[PDB]
């Protein structure tokens, strides 16, 4: 259906030896396609997805120039942020930002995002109108005034309409078999007696893509959200994801409980009980 090209950028003012001053990772939906970094002023790039083998040499040469420019600019901005907040040197500070564009089923643009953070806290966000900015304090208010009086958001629009959509379209075509798919979950309920005499029922979902999923338990008809123990959805490492959700129930009443699995690879939620 809908698809997104997303970049996650990090710049660090005082990295340790061997650690990058700048690193960015790029994804289409939930699949990583490259890593870029700069360590001691040396830029490096690595492909992470099969369709990147299709890219012509010029893609990588142009990417390397971008890494050099971005790392240099981010370092300069870290210097300035240090001064505006009157923060001492000798400590390491962090500038992060996210860049993305999204298309709908017709492969036409739906939205875009640019958002930045300083030392792990929101600093400035480009609004949905793609022309005004949301600030958080007096310093980021200075940034807002500068970007808005300069119209800098117009340059981001040009990036979105140009390179961002170019790559997103091209990656979706070349990697169609990987990206334009949904693997539904393989689910089962595990049974774990406890010394108290009660029972843990753990509903598992394995092997699904994309990562978005909902697991929930019901007894008869009531939802048991407040009674559940969940784990965060986690990568299996082969391109698919896994998750489980558990409830503690009395012995002999296990058949009263139903697990429901919601995933875009299914047309209706999967329902299952302990067998």
């Amino acid at each position: 259906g809908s698809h997104s090209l997303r970049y996650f950028h990090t710049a660090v003012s005082r990295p340790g030896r061997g650690e990058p001053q700048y690193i960015s990772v790029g994804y289409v939906d939930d699949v990583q396609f490259q890593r870029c970094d700069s360590i001691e002023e040396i830029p490096r790039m690595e492909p992470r997805a099969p369709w990147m083998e299709k890219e012509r040499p010029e893609y990588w040469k142009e990417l390397k120039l971008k890494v050099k420019n971005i790392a240099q600019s981010a370092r300069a901005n870290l210097r300035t942020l240090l001064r505006y907040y009157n923060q001492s040197e000798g400590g390491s500070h962090i500038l992060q930002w996210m860049v993305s564009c999204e298309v709908g089923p017709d492969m036409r643009l739906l939205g875009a995002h640019y958002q930045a953070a300083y030392d792990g806290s929101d600093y400035i966000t480009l609004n949905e109108d793609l022309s005004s900015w949301t600030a958080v304090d007096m310093v980021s208010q200075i940034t807002k005034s500068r970007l808005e009086s300069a119209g800098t958001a117009e340059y981001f629009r040009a990036y979105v309409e140009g390179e961002c959509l170019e790559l997103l379209h091209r990656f979706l075509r070349n990697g169609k078999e990987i990206l334009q798919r949904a693997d539904p979950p393989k689910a089962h309920v595990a049974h774990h007696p406890r010394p108290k005499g009660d029972v843990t029922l753990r509903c598992w979902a394995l092997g699904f893509y994309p990562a978005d999923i909902t697991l929930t338990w019901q007894k008869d008809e009531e939802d048991l959200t407040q009674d559940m123990e969940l784990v965060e959805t986690r990568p299996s490492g082969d391109g698919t994801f896994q998750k489980w959700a558990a409830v503690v129930v009395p012995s002999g009443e296990e058949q009263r409980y139903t697990c429901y699995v919601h995933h875009e690879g299914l047309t209706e939620p999967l329902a299952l009980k302990w067998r």
């Binding site: 970049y7 901005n77 942020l81 640019y114």
Partner: peptide, 7 residues
Amino acid sequence: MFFINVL
């Protein structure tokens, strides 16, 4: 692969 100067 895009960057905006904040200050």
